[model samples]
Target: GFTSKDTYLSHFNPRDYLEKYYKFGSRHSAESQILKHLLKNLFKIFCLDGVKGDLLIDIGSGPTIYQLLSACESFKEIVVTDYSDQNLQELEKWLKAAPAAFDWSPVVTYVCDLEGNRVKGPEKEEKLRQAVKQVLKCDVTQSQPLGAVPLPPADCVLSTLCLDAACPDLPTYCRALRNLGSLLKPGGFLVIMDALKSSYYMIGEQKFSSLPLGREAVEAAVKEAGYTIEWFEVISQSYSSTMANNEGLFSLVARKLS
Candidate 1:
């Protein structure tokens, strides 16, 4: 049997994960409210014309591209990464226009509409696909998260619900945050979205561990990683059985300080 951390480090099936959690129908699920909240806020930030950069890296970009939609217009290159080959392949599926790729039209339309475009959703989607230069593998626990593929210091890094979902404890989570922060240029941006106090979530027959973190702990970790907070928000969820022990969702934007 895989231990708690091992499950995320190796055992979890990214294909199963995407089928369960990110399919178009999942947009209507109760848990998807968190994703909707994240998308809305991310769109708002991009609309301010503040998050632009030369290169944007998305860490632990599990089989999803919605997070990158708003960033495509702002950045010249986007690199998305994950530890799992299955996840990377799934992301590539969309990038390659593979048959049976998950439909993200709804998500694209939502973001486009937020940007005041009601009919250019497909155009926006294509732009994002082109902006994505690479879909490589990453291990947050590593000092070089991208392993041997040396990368330029990124102008912005987006990590959503990844650290707590993968790290087994606070120390490891903080270490992972610092490792990710190392990839940012001094004064570059880091955007994070995570479930607050979430200890576990289920996919099919498997239950994966979460770090059970709170707002203060997250803020402390960011600061400890040498990031200056620029914006933060938390949304409390109404208690529900399907919430899988998650209490709330938090979104934060910070700048790395040398």
Candidate 2:
């Protein structure tokens, strides 16, 4: 049986999720490339010279900031959103530099190094925090995901690893993309970083479901959501697993039709 949104939230523990995927796991190297190299590089292509946006809204951000590292260099004001309050709390801890927060210094250092500086990773980390305006709750199921928050639409919406976990079925996935589209201005773009045929991922011992998707379904969904695919890339996974079943990954940049 597929895990419903309720069950996924109920079983969700940010600590375990981070540990399994971010801290210690057999998937460590591959995961690192996804966050540090793959996402960072993909974002650069989207933000290519003079194509930057003034406001960027990141949806379903989970508990991590890795995905936004490349965004800060381009998007001036960033508003982060997630469905879970616990995840927001985790983000706040890091944003505030709480001593007890999960140490992201190394990850930050790496991204900065890729950007061509050291920081201390601390300096770049501090600068990135300034661009982040606030953390808000966003539920993909709603027509207004931010729910009367009345924020302005973004020039671009960046999302990674969100849809597969939030959507229970194909219809829901399609609707989720449309809702994501609504957050953007006409002609604004969206970026999706995800894995295909990734039916489930684990946190601690809990099995959280991800709707298995393929290239054809994804491309079709992007078109169906009133978007024109601008760029797309997919890479095969060399690693095998019981923790998650991701056959490969797909990263795409799409622009909303005006």
Candidate 3:
């Protein structure tokens, strides 16, 4: 139902969304396991020798900065983008250390620990904040998603759980991938996190319909979009709640063919 309307506009309360899913403390829950998987894989991906770049663009970034914790070290400029102003502003609040911004310390601590204690949580947070050079609005539907903005193609593009939210159907999802791929230079890398076979997700009392995507369809889409897959892995969902109905979460790193 969110397709006809703006998916995140009607009832997307970023702060509430964070509280509902990202609030940490319990160490052995579904959300914690999800975070652990994400943080660990992202760390490995960013550490890969080929992951270096001058610019990294994150599309439909939502209100979370944890996704970019590893990215900050891999690129000089990080662009955080979303379709909703609310999501953008909520994240900007954290970048500015504004009062009432959702606390990100716990995740930062976890990420630092993953790096073998070489960096402290606060230090890594500061580093990420500084690396983030811009927060812009983006619509993935357009072939030129950033429209009229002029810059060289990015060396890397990262999108997290965004295509399923914005696209109403499989075709739209595939097109969105190509649109994002357009932002990357040949041989540039793309890192994407998505919920596979998910039909819907919950944020507070609102339900957002998602395009249910299967692994084969996604693989076909990636190939058709002119990318060579480097890594693709899935972790089955464990929430077992009304919050969402995704079969699993998949994260992948691919390269745009030269």
Candidate 4:
């Protein structure tokens, strides 16, 4: 039962996904360089002293916490979501500081340094663990991505490598963007990180497909989805010799229109 959509919905092994792409030692890998760079850039923007908010939502957060390390102090509450139950379990393990959970200390240190703190890494980690309130399931394909659970619109939404990886085509990508936008309050921030020209990526032996898109398409989609772009940057990488299939990474910050 293999279809185009199944590339993400089915055959997605959360354990394999984490081990291959998000292991603790991945920080120094060349394969992880671009992601780290993108995260640093994102942190630099939201780590400002004035970026405080009431609630922040992280959509399709694959068993990863580094993306939110720099955001913990900026928001009063944090919620993370994913379609995979295994991914949710992994996130919960880290949040609970359970034994054998992936080590995120290095990432915590990196983010702390970005915030101009050479120490206090452990304090930052605790802050993030306490700030997180919920880890729920989400499906971007559905009109209400959070299903029956209705939530007050969030003050900010951070989506990293979710829509492009889950969507099968351009139209689906745009629809997903709109669906995500609906979760934000008026004038709320929408921060996104996507892989450009990435048609497929590997998780163990499984090959998951992505909706290949360029800068123009992403900008147009964000505008059409009722958001005003504040900042957008793309970092091209030479992954031709790598097993992964992305040409570049795109990061953008947009505001939902009132």
Name the candidate that leads on lDDT: 3
1 or 4, which is superior by TM-score?
A: 1
What is the Cα-based lDDT of residue 215 in candidate 1?
94
**Prediction 2 global C-alpha lDDT:** 0.79
Q: What total of clashing residue pairs does each candidate reach? A: 0, 0, 0, 0
- lDDT comparing candidate 4 with the true structure: 0.80
Model 1 poorest 10 in a row by lDDT:
1-10
Could you tell me the lDDT of residue 92 within candidate 1?
92
lDDT over C-alpha atoms for residue 193 of model 1: 87
Which candidate number has the best TM-score? 3
Q: Worst 10-residue stretch by lDDT in candidate 2? A: 42-51
RMSD of candidate 4 to the true fold? Answer: 2.3
Each candidate structure's TM-score, on Cα atoms with residue i matched to residue i, is 0.92, 0.92, 0.96, 0.92
Question: In candidate 4, which residue pairs get closer than 3 Å at backbone N, Cα or C atoms, i.e. clash?
Answer: none
Cα error, residue 240 of model 2, in Å, equals 4.9
Q: Flag the better candidate by TM-score, 1 or 3.
A: 3
Output the lDDT of residue 202, model 4.
72
- Please give the lDDT score at residue 159 for candidate 3: 89
Q: Could you give candidate 3's per-residue lDDT for residues 107-202 as a string of tens digits?
A: 999888887888998789888989987888888988988888766799999988888888887788789889998899999998888888988888
lDDT for model 3, please.
0.85
Which lDDT tens digits does candidate 4 get at residues 28-147?
A: 675567656866876776775345588999999988887888788789889999987777887898899998688777667767777788558778888999899999999887778999
